[PDB]
Design a binder for this molecule. Sequence first.
Ligand code: PLP
Ligand code: PLP
Lengths: 359, 359
Amino acid sequence: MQAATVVINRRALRHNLQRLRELAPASKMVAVVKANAYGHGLLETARTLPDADAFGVARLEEALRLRAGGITKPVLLLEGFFDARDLPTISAQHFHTAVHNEEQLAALEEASLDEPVTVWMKLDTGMHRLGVRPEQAEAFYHRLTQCKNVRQPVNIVSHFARADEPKCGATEKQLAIFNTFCEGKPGQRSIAASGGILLWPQSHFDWVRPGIILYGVSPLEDRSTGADFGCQPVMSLTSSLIAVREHKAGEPVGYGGTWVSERDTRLGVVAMGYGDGYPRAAPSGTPVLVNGREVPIVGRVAMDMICVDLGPQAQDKAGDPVILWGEGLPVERIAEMTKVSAYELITRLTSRVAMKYVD
Amino acid sequence: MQAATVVINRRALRHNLQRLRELAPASKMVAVVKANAYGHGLLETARTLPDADAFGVARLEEALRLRAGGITKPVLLLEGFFDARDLPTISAQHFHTAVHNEEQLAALEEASLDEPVTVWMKLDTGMHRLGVRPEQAEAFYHRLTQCKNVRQPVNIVSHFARADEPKCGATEKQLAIFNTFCEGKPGQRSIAASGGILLWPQSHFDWVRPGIILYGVSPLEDRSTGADFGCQPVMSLTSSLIAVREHKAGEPVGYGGTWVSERDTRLGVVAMGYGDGYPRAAPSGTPVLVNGREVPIVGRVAMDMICVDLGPQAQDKAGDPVILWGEGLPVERIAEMTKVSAYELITRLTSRVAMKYVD
Ligand SMILES: *Cc1c(COP(=O)(O)O)cnc(C)c1O
Ligand SMILES: *Cc1c(COP(=O)(O)O)cnc(C)c1O
């Protein structure tokens, strides 16, 4: 292929897992690979990290897809199970699960399983998304230690809502609540994801759950990159030019006549659009690398194409290599220029994009 | 349980192709199915419309995927071919192609094919994206009529840049240029897509290329839906609740503490996020249907989850049906609220979303 392609550096992936073990030296690793491993490929990303202590996924379907591909490490269902009839599979597949509601707990109480299941009680410490609230947590917790279907001890998990904002006391407050509930309880503790790992060493505890930074991308919007933490970028969104055309001063480009040229120039057309996952919101001027040289996007990003300004005697030609982000252009730079989160940029890509794996 | 799923109404798809034949009664139909048929499924959308005169795709890869699935109809390569070594496949697969540059034409000229290929010369009439400029078009055109590898006559294609803006004279100008070049030439003429079909009956000519409106979605940003033109919505982005929790006044929700509640209420958590293709940009208040009742999104949309405000004694529960858009809630209403183009909303979805076909 020469069009929409994501190149995944397996070497950078391994480097990052090891680099994260250096940053959180007393904690085991839950490699978070939900949403097709953040756009890098669920199964391939798991196979690249046979050293991971466990893998984290959002849904049951993702975990099963890992077992189907031969992945054997423990897989953590971060949101738990959505149907009580799933417990038998989860037990047999040796999936570890979070438990945040009455339905899940009552399911565990009355299920009949050939083996008990490892559980992580999800505690709501401030995010107010999933989890048992503090005032209901002690009773809920106690019921889990009385389950024959739950492998003792009951582990405790939680998640930060604003760890990337060190100046507000949100994280210290969640930590305060997390610590109060865990006092005197056995079982592993886990509350830190990318942000907690890098900015809060007092939240590492027993297990940390690296997601975005595992792929060498910073979880912060302070324009820092994965390299700020010694992590190497894994993904490169690439394509090729499918046309190099003459253009003249005063002439607009693309839908809505969004951009008008102030000079005679040459425009390049890239085989990349939002039908591939590239943000339609990308404003003119956003950087793209053409033949390893940065050129600006001019005009509205279409479903399948993107126009760039090369210059009046630019000698680039149809077929030449284009980098939307990757090697000489961090996805964080593209997130600042487009105002789109790096999390979304690397993850919200379509099945039209080819996948390459190197090293 | 059910999670992220796109339900495709085959009946509505059929209705729209027929409805468009009623709006452009003297023109053949090029069903545009590029980018996985605008998120509806490339092969299934083609199989639902065996009545289409032809199918349009962005890339050669998409056309070959159609032939692989048993689609037998003529397929139009809207951007042409990117490599001269592809002509033999194009010829053998009976793919019709656009020709916009020197490389493609020179390729046609010196290739040796067992059969000639049907071609549509792409003329740049104002969009300044792809196509031969007016002052180079006559010479370029004449070389195509002299090709033994091109099945005569040479057809002429072009595309509108601002057909959804009837008040600016952009479309009349492109039409003026298109008409001047086609004078005295045989061969089919085609310049109209969804907008040209609905708003410009002078631009129908021989072939019209319905894309977005084929799926029952309006190409305008004037709070018009597909129903404004008698077209029925084909896609329904659905999911289910995975939690219904108590929440209290003054408490924030989600990452960044984006939303704070002014009352004790109950929050629902949807198995839908941008890891599925749902816009991370969706602001609190964006409508979502829970049990066929509209509730607002509260807090930042995460990779796998979305929180909604149900009410203090709302009786919704984990497992209940959620509609992100579809029946009861047009994607155009979500586009207006989120400020994201309906084109991108239905198209930029990930492979995590399951596909259902009804009728
Ligand atoms: C997805 C998620 C993570 C990883 O988050 P990052 O910000 O990419 O580090 C960890 N834990 C939970 C509970 C999550 O849902
Ligand atoms: C995608 C495309 C279409 C369809 O346009 P809509 O506005 O979605 O109908 C038709 N023709 C060409 C050249 C295209 O690239």
